[PDB]
Amino acid sequence: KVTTVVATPGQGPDRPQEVSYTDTKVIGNGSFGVVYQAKLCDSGELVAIKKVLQDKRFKNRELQIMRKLDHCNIVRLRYFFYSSKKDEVYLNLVLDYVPETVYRVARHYSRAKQTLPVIYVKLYMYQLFRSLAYIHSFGICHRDIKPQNLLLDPDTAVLKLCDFGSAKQLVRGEPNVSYICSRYYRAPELIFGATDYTSSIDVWSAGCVLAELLLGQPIFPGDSGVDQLVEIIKVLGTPTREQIREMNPNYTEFKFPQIKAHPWTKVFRPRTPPEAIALCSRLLEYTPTARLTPLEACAHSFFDELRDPNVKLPNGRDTPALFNFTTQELSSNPPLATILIPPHAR
């Protein structure tokens, strides 16, 4: 069937308009809601429609958040609309469809017993850090960074961050739930029960993604909340009293056996690019404030090849847009712009 709705532009404005779409099929079902794929009649362009049950006298966090965003590495909100079980209200997020994920790409190499080419590791991570730099600049923390939430256009290698269903605009002093983020990517402060954490939890999760791309498997595969810390301790060792205070000031453990960190160079297979390991060690820190900011990560030596005039994908194609920074995106450290934007890009 062809389906016609009255919908509001994502950005917008903001004047409701008629939108028609067809070829509606389910591509996901969860405790959050349902996701459909569809085709826009006027355009031909494919879209994902995320349908969520909505408390009619409450505002939706994800919507409010999605409306603020416009960035080449974030999934675009094209439209939103409501339905109508009788008195029941659903909010529908109409998103640009993206066929692949970093998960399903890394899984393909992992099953073929091989590692993702270094160049893609640079491309995906760099675009990830950019999306973080952008959302963090509004004070928005994603709270669910993982490979499944990193969409990929397999031809252009454009990465788009998706799934803001856990996202929140963080306000200091106002506490946030600790049981958040997928377990494998959950920062240690969260496991320790922090309610006063920051956007740097996303950087930790970004480190786990990086490490995972390097190992061909999750670096910290905890079987449970407690086991997740066991897994972290195997690599980082136990945290110092000062690191514990920095993660959660309201947590005290007077007595515990101290364990030294495992060397980073032995965590990864011997041929792992040393610069990838070096970057990893500055993301996977216990001390939340010692982690690199996303912008700082973007400027790391590891992404130097991306700044080289002559860089190409293995498929011969040019790389996607990497250097189109905005003042919003650079706001945490505006001077870094002259390093992030190479001379050949101005």
Partner: peptide, 23 residues
């Protein structure tokens, strides 16, 4: 470990218990 974790966090035994499970 959701109630277990909660108990470990409330009791101040998290690191002690994680270290034990390390062996």
């Amino acid at each position: 470990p959701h109630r277990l974790l909660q108990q470990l966090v409330l009791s101040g035994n998290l690191i002690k218990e994680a270290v034990r499970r390390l062996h």
